[PDB]
Amino acid sequence: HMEITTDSLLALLGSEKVKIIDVRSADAYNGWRMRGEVRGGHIKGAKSLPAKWLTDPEWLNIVRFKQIRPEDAIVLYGYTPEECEQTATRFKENGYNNVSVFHRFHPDWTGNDAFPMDRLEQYNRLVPAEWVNGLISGEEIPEYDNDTFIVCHAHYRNRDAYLSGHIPGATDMDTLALESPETWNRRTPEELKKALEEHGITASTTVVLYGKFMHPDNADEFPGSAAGHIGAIRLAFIMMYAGVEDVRVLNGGYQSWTDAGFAISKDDVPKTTVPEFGAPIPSRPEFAVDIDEAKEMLQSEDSDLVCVRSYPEYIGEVSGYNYIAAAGRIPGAIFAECGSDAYHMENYRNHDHTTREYHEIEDIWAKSGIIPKKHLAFYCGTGWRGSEAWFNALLMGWPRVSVYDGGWFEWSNDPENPYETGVP
Ligand SMILES: [Cl-]
Numbered sequence: 001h002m003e004i005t006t007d008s009l010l011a012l013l014g015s016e017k018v019k020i021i022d023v024r025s026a027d028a029y030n031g032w033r034m035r036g037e038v039r040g041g042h043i044k045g046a047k048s049l050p051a052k053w054l055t056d057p058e059w060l061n062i063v064r065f066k067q068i069r070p071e072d073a074i075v076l077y078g079y080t081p082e083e084c085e086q087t088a089t090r091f092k093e094n095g096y097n098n099v100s101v102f103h104r105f106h107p108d109w110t111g112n113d114a115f116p117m118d119r120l121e122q123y124n125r126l127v128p129a130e131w132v133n134g135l136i137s138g139e140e141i142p143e144y145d146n147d148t149f150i151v152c153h154a155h156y157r158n159r160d161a162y163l164s165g166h167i168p169g170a171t172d173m174d175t176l177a178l179e180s181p182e183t184w185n186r187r188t189p190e191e192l193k194k195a196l197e198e199h200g201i202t203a204s205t206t207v208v209l210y211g212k213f214m215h216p217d218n219a220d221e222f223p224g225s226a227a228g229h230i231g232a233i234r235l236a237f238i239m240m241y242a243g244v245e246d247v248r249v250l251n252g253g254y255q256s257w258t259d260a261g262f263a264i265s266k267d268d269v270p271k272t273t274v275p276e277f278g279a280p281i282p283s284r285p286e287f288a289v290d291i292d293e294a295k296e297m298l299q300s301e302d303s304d305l306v307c308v309r310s311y312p313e314y315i316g317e318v319s320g321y322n323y324i325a326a327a328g329r330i331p332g333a334i335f336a337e338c339g340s341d342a343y344h345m346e347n348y349r350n351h352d353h354t355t356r357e358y359h360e361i362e363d364i365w366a367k368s369g370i371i372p373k374k375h376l377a378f379y380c381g382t383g384w385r386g387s388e389a390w391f392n393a394l395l396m397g398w399p400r401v402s403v404y405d406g407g408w409f410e411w412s413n414d415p416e417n418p419y420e421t422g423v424p
């Protein structure tokens, strides 16, 4: 495979005929200093294509979907050039003849302030499995300055999602612990305080949330019981609102843990009780928007509601849910199509359930005027997909992002509220 020099690559940055491809993990791409480098993240302009994906049959379709074409001048890099070899070969097997390998990313590029790098601003909230393993193992890990933690396996009324296999020592939290199946909103401060204490969580506990994807099927009574990692990010939103100061989400959920080769447990870990949550609830009320404020936001050039629903929901063909009667949409919201239905987030995720390359999310959002200079309230049917979209924006450092918790459920439950239906 041909080589490209540091000075060459520097001189080509920002040319849209050269495509720089980072074959490290998405977590390293996002900013994690996985090998102790002094500066983490990716070469400015690079795209993420983890070499992990070479063993998935999806690999070539992913490359094409990311608009990487045989006529492009491709530059690969990783922590070492040897870690790019298989990727370079797979590119050449498929007719990509202009592929170079950059050998000097680590430590030459990472170690030199003069060479541009980008990262997900708040990447340390989105943790890799190696970090969780280090935490549970009591090993020295970056981006961690606490002495108290809990790993929590989220599910919706489905303890078998946890009992069938979970991260060692993790305890399970039913989403019903922190949200009401009546309002479908976060529970009251009194209920949240007791639920968090009864799961062993204080405001100063580092909480690591993850869930298990189990292929939600709309034929089933409770499809959300299979959307465990959306549920985990929903709980992360509620905990962050409530006032857990250090909340992490395992990137890609349970699949990232098993893909990393770590041990699986089926033990039913008994919960520890803490006497005091230790902070006022909610300590971050600005993260939640309720319906009166949502109506105000529809009337301002400064703010917008962001509808993270599926297309059949948006045009009012279906409600999206076997527990929501009305079909339709909130007038004036910006559509940010989630994916295929109320329980999938394909447009925000990779095929391995890790978050989609954040620049892609940002670019698609920008085309619809979903931009950080606005106060945005993300929502959906009842707040699950909205919370995952919100979390992605939070990770990018957007300063005024919220979840409009009530969503379409609360909106349509008031017959006085106007709605739209049909193709726009
Ligand atoms: Cl890596």
Ligand SMILES: [Cl-]
Pocket: 036, 037, 038, 039, 106, 107, 108, 110, 111
């Ligand atoms: Cl370095």
Ligand SMILES: [Cl-]
Pocket: 211, 212, 213, 214, 226, 227, 228, 229, 230, 231
């Ligand atoms: Cl999921």
Ligand SMILES: [Cl-]
Pocket: 307, 309, 314, 328, 329, 330, 333, 408
């Ligand atoms: Cl809507």
Ligand SMILES: [Mg+2]
Pocket: 141, 142, 144
């Ligand atoms: Mg340290």
Ligand SMILES: [Mg+2]
Pocket: 183, 184, 185, 186, 381, 382, 383, 404, 405, 406, 407
């Ligand atoms: Mg809600």
Ligand SMILES: [Mg+2]
Pocket: 156, 223, 224, 225
């Ligand atoms: Mg559900």
Ligand SMILES: [Mg+2]
Pocket: 271, 272, 273
């Ligand atoms: Mg106890």
